[PDB]
Design a protein around this nucleic acid. Structure first.
Ligand SMILES: [Zn+2]
Length: 260
DNA sequence: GGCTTCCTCCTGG
DNA sequence: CCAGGAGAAGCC
């Protein structure tokens, strides 16, 4: 789950939690990436004022603090009709006053449920790069940040210090749309290439948001994917069979003709 | 930055 | 029949 998927979950849950009250949480396995925060256990009758996002983190605004939720590699969020019985990987619920439930499912348990009084200060949000859809992320910034790099552009795009929300899928997809070889040294991109890359990253992410993100009710974006997970298949633009490689042991996909 | 690691569930081979 | 793949900390 990357920024589009996380953004999709935020919009899907917002109209259901905003204005409603958390009676309490139900935890059936608190051993996530980190231990579930104490304060989540103690939650009692708290109204949700807002549902926001920072990077791949969802933020529930409560009066005295914030619930920080991360989906990791296999987490998801559902608002359930009512006292629907949980499944073995349904590790955390938010029992709402409106009779609905916020149900979190996460087989690998690489997700997280954390509490912070103030968003600012430290915690997992500190040191996060700029939002890619923000004006803070642009070609001149990108160019600036690459000049000292010594490695490939593709893993660099997936580095939250440079920018947030672009994970394995949209890193490969964005470079395709920009026509940039993922093995290209980051330092070797031109200001112009940086400018186009930042532009297509926004377009690609905004597109997947619009269609509910990628499904690996599911998402409708997997069918618009140009390169990710299409090894051997013909490039939708030129037919040359899609090539697969790896960066930091994550799969990366590209078209050896459309990308240079 | 690259590699490995947490954890469980399919599946391609 | 099953090893291998499927965010980001915490090493380097
Ligand atoms: Zn092509």
């Amino acid at each position: 789950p990357e920024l589009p998927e996380v953004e999709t979950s935020r919009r899907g849950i917002e109209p259901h939690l905003v204005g409603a009250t958390i009676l309490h949480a139900v935890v059936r396995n608190g051993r996530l990436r980190w231990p579930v925060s104490e304060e989540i256990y103690r939650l009692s009758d708290q109204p949700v004022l807002s549902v926001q996002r920072r990077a791949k983190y969802l933020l529930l605004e409560l009066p005295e603090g914030w619930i920080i939720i991360h989906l990791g590699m296999s987490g998801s969020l559902r608002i359930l009709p009512e006292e629907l019985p949980p499944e073995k990987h349904d590790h955390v619920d938010l029992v709402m006053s409106n009779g609905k439930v916020l149900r979190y499912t996460d087989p690998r348990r690489f997700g997280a449920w954390l509490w912070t009084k103030e968003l600012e200060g430290h915690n997992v949000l500190t040191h996060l790069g700029p939002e890619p859809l923000s004006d803070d992320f642009n070609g001149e910034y990108l160019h600036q940040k690459c000049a000292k790099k010594k490695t490939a552009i593709k893993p660099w795009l997936m580095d939250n210090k440079l920018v947030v929300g672009v994970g394995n899928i949209y890193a490969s997809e964005s470079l395709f749309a920009a026509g940039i070889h993922p093995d290209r040294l980051a330092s070797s991109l031109s200001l112009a290439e940086c400018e186009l890359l930042a532009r297509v990253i926004k377009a690609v992410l905004l597109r997947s948001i619009e269609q509910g993100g990628t499904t690996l009710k599911p998402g409708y974006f997997a069918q618009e994917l140009q390169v990710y997970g299409r090894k051997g298949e013909p490039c939708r633009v030129c037919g040359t069979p899609i090539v697969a490689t790896k960066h930091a042991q994550r799969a990366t996909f590209y078209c050896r003709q459309c990308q240079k």
